Amino acid sequence: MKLTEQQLLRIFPNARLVAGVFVVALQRAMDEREIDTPARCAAFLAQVGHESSQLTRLVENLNYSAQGLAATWPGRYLGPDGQPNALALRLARNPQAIADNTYATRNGNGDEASGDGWRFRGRGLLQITGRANYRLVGEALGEPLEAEPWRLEQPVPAARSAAWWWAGHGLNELADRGEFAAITRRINGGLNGQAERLALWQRARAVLS
Amino acid sequence: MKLTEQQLLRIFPNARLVAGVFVVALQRAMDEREIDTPARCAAFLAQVGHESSQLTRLVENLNYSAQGLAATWPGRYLGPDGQPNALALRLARNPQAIADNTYATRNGNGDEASGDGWRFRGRGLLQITGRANYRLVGEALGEPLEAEPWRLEQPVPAARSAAWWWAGHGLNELADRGEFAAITRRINGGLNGQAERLALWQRARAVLS
């Protein structure tokens, strides 16, 4: 394989500003994890491109309204009334407080007071969340992700972390067989955004063919 | 008073990469705090110019060697053999750990495990350090500096925080009287870097005359 910046802009047009640095980051991460054929690369690029809004969103958005908190984490933020409860009202529209509360004690995070929920909110192309996962990924990649979680918003850690996760979940062999929807299920635990993933995938297959 | 980009670049030649994004910030901050004459403005720009390396260094550098630790905080990191002690060896060349230890429980910071020391390390033109000071200044500027301390590395909060501190410590009236060395003592508690402060001062006086 070989990916050209021309090919990137045709697949991720909204990455014009980042495509220059991402092209080397992606090419190297893809070689590193044997994402090494048009079929493997098209599937990989289609999935990470959906999950990262074409390389423009590498950090999770926690700007929820009180109604959004109640819809998203109802066991936490929905009252017996069908209305946002008092906790939802207290945290509404405050991303740091939302993450610090919602993700406390999740995936190796400390408690609310630790600030771990915000500190280790989702980052990357295929997003990594929680202290223990930043630790695990940082150690697999030889980068200081637990100490510097913001590194996952930068091209090389984002690309290498996504390629590592991809190859480690058997997604290369799924791509070999053309089982794209089965890849979507493994990444999403469902088929949310499948229509969008499929359109990116068919673009990428045409470009990389 | 009016301050032009070309004037700023004549006072701060090394500001060439940021002058365009600092000129309005500085003009507005100076107006806001009555830094409103050539003499007040020349003194202010000379001091913030020295303290920020002509607007090129808006966050403190904590990349110390074990020897630098011992030399900079001899009381904390220097040993009786004139050698860095064991704590200094532990922390050497790790800025996060250095800040977390050296500044813990300083200026409202928590302990070394809180991470306050690094989180609220020095930022701005006249540098602000420590949780309680970020909260003090954020509240006085109406900016969310305690929640987002990195904002003090941006032009408007850096300039406004420096103008607020300047006017709040009587330095406008000292500038009125030409008492430049008195200003240095209030900022530095000594006369360190006075040669460079005076050089910038006389330059600023000529440009703004």
Author numbering:
A (entry chain A), B (entry chain B): 1 to 209
Copy out sentences from the published article reporting this entry, exactly as the authors wrote them.
Endolysins are phage-encoded enzymes that cleave the peptidoglycan of host bacteria. Our results support the proposed model, whereby uses holin proteins (Hol, AlpB, and CidA) in combination with the cryptic prophage PaGH19Lys endolysin , to induce bacterial lysis, which is crucial for membrane vesicle production, pyocin release, and biofilm formation.
Finally, the crystal structure of PaGH19Lys was determined and solved to 1.8 Å resolution. The protein contains a deep-spanning catalytic cleft with an active site comprised of amino acids H50, E51, E60, Y103, Q127, T129, I187, N188, and R197. Based on the structural comparison of PaGH19Lys with the well-characterized GH19 endolysin SPN1S, , the amino acids E60 and E51 were identified as the putative catalytic acid and base, respectively. Some lytic activity could be observed for the E60Q variant at 1 μM, but it was still significantly lower than that of the wild-type protein. Comparison of the structures of PaGH19Lys and the SPN1S endolysin revealed substantial similarities, particularly in the active sites, suggesting that they have similar functions. The topology of the endolysin active-site cleft may reflect adaptation to accommodate the peptide stems of the PG.
